[PDB]
Amino acid sequence: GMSLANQIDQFLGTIMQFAENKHEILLGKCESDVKLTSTQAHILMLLAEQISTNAKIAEKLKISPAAVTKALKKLQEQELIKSSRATNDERVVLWSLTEKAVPVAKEHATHHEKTLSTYQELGNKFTDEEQEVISKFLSALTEEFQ
Amino acid sequence: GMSLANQIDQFLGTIMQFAENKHEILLGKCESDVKLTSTQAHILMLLAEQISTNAKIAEKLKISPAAVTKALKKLQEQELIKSSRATNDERVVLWSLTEKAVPVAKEHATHHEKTLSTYQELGNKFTDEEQEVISKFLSALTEEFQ
Ligand SMILES: [Zn+2]
Ligand SMILES: [Zn+2]
Ligand SMILES: [Zn+2]
Ligand SMILES: [Zn+2]
Known part of the structure; x- marks a missing residue:
């Protein structure tokens, strides 16, 4: 029976408690232990759908190509994605899930x-x-x- | 004009963006650069009110004496609080703001x-x-x- 201000405070406190060290609020049992940023996980989700390029990625995720590069590079280091070159266009670097x-x-x-x-x-x-x-x-x- | 689910998602996303690396949602221009946990800042606030003991602290903040000790020790290392001994009872360790x-x-x-x-x-x-x-x-x- 607290004030709304207090309930809002508790609610936001519960969100921060729930988030712990994550920067994305997500429900659902979580099994994976693969530490990813949210931008990185969203690239993953995209590539689960369709092998893609940094352009298509930046567009889809509405972030800059530069930020896509940063994420890809980290994902790639973790061998979560791999680059390939498009068979019809050697200038085209594709990214897909390992x-x-x-x-x-x-x-x-x-x-x-x-x-x-x-x-x-x-x-x-x-x-x-x-x-x-x-x-x-x-x-x-x-x-x-x- | 998004679904409520989407608006709730955006809202929580905005909270996580706003929180950045903090675990407490706080509005107001913030000048201090003193990196504190929330439990530590709340001990500070308490002692701003009244020199206090670890017991009174744990009680007031509804956390365990053990967690009070941990915070005090960190605050004390940062010389944000200082312990003293109660003049009427040598068994009594008081804590106050520096x-x-x-x-x-x-x-x-x-x-x-x-x-x-x-x-x-x-x-x-x-x-x-x-x-x-x-x-x-x-x-x-x-x-x-x-
Ligand atoms: Zn998960
Ligand atoms: Zn996500
Ligand atoms: Zn501040
Ligand atoms: Zn606080």
Whole structure:
């Protein structure tokens, strides 16, 4: 029965507790021990879908080619991805998952879907009017953190 | 105009972005550079109020005496607090801020009040019924993270 301010405080405290040293909030049992940044895991997820290039990656992930390079290089060092050259265009460097990465990508993607479906399920317990309230609260609150 | 699940995702993403390497969400301009854990800063805030003992501290902060010891020892190493012995009872080890700590405590406390007052202000833009909605949403969401 605390104030909303206190409940918001506890909620955000619970998020930071839950995040521990991670920078991404993800639900779902987590088996992998492969320490990845979020940008790195998202490259993995992308490549689980389709062998891709740094251009297509930067575009898809809406980050800079430079940041894609940094992540690829780290992923590659960890032998989670491997570069190849496109058979039809020698200028084209492709990136794809190594077999070691496939479960890592598929796991992170499963987290994403588990998390999002949990939020959607929650969302669905509220009526439109309630969802607008929650959406307006979230927007206001998000603004305080940007 | 995204789904609520997506907005919740973005919101939590914005929190993790905002937190960066911190484990406490705090609003307010931050000048101090004194790297502290949250438990350490809260001991500081306590001692800004009143010279205190490890017992009174563990009680007030609802953590174990053992965790108080760990924090005090770190604070003490950083010369942010100093131990003294109670003049009326030689068995009593008191802890108080060093002059260096006073602005650090007062700053962290100011963060707490700034953050909480910002949440309260936000809270106050919503009617009771809306606050219950937000409170119920927060509770449900908090449960997914515990
Ligand atoms: Zn996992
Ligand atoms: Zn992710
Ligand atoms: Zn500060
Ligand atoms: Zn604090």
